[PDB]
């Protein structure tokens, strides 16, 4: 198991392309997205409603942060949107693990 | 980042509303829902809750009103797992997560 | 509160019923399953599984044999998450998931 942190970004859905963006740049090797339903309290919402949620597992803790410093300075004050953080182990994952695999022992 | 517990339910589609009702009762800031499928102990169609709480009593006092109404005549499971709020103005305050 | 083990599988969707059937084989109570979208427009589609477990082998169990099934030739990332359950008859069992003895 490879100890990982995974970075929940939900948001609106409009934003897709442009934070697909941001994690293709920041060196994450991929993300999982999916269309929810919300009701939120920052009352932002640009114009329960539909959303996004972006889930990017990152090796590092500060990869995840840069990401989600990145999108919340560049969107959050503008459009609706929640980031936070969870504890994960990867156990597969060949691009996540590289070809050595993610250990076990 | 502040802690943070993520409440997340899974239950059956027609709670929907009911559901809302009762984590928008518990003081708890929002919540987010999804179309999900499933299988349980005796493929079909049902939703997940995911709420984020600031307190492990409040996202309890979520579970036990919903379990407490619905569970012994709908399905549904009920967990909750420990998450850090980078960002989020309501959640956070306008002095933002740096908590 | 009773402790378990939220697996995550998200793979592809062809994949479903091969998995599902994997999981129905490891003992573990029910699975959650949901369409997604993933990057590894280069979005595809895929699938990911929820299965929360008593143990930690159950849970290894199930990725193991998922994994060296299919993630030569399908794309696929698994990974687990700590979680505790409140409330589930079938996870928990008649007593509930808050018993003492
Ligand atoms: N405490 C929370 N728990 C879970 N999800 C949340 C929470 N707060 C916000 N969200 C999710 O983040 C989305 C954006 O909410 P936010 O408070 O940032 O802005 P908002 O304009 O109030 O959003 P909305 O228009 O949905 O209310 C919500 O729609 C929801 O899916
Ligand atoms: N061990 C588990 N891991 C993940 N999700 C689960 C688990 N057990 C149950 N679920 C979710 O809870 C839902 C309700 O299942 P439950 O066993 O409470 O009742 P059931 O009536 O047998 O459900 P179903 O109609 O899906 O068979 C399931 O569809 C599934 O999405
Ligand atoms: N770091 C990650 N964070 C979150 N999800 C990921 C990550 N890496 C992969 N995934 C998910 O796993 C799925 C399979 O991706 P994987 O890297 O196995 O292969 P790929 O062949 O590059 O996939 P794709 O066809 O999606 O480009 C992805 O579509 C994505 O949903
Ligand atoms: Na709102
Ligand atoms: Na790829």
Redesign the interface.
């Known amino acids: 198991?490879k100890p990982?942190n995974?970075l929940?970004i939900?948001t609106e859905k409009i934003l897709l392309?442009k934070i697909?963006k941001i994690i293709?740049e920041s060196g994450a090797?991929?993300?999982?997205?999916?269309?929810?339903?919300?009701?939120?309290?920052?009352?932002?919402r640009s114009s329960?409603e539909a959303?996004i949620?972006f889930e990017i597992?990152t090796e590092t803790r500060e990869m995840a942060?840069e990401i989600?410093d990145r999108?919340?300075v560049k969107y959050?004050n503008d459009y609706a949107?929640?980031?936070?953080?969870?504890?994960?182990?990867?156990?597969?994952?060949?691009?996540?693990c590289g070809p050595e695999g993610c250990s076990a022992w």
């Open positions: 198991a990982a995974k929940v939900v392309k697909a293709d090797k991929g993300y999982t997205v999916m269309n929810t339903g919300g009701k939120g309290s920052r009352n932002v329960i959303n949620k597992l942060e989600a999108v919340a959050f949107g929640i980031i936070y953080i969870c504890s994960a182990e990867v156990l597969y994952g060949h691009t996540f």
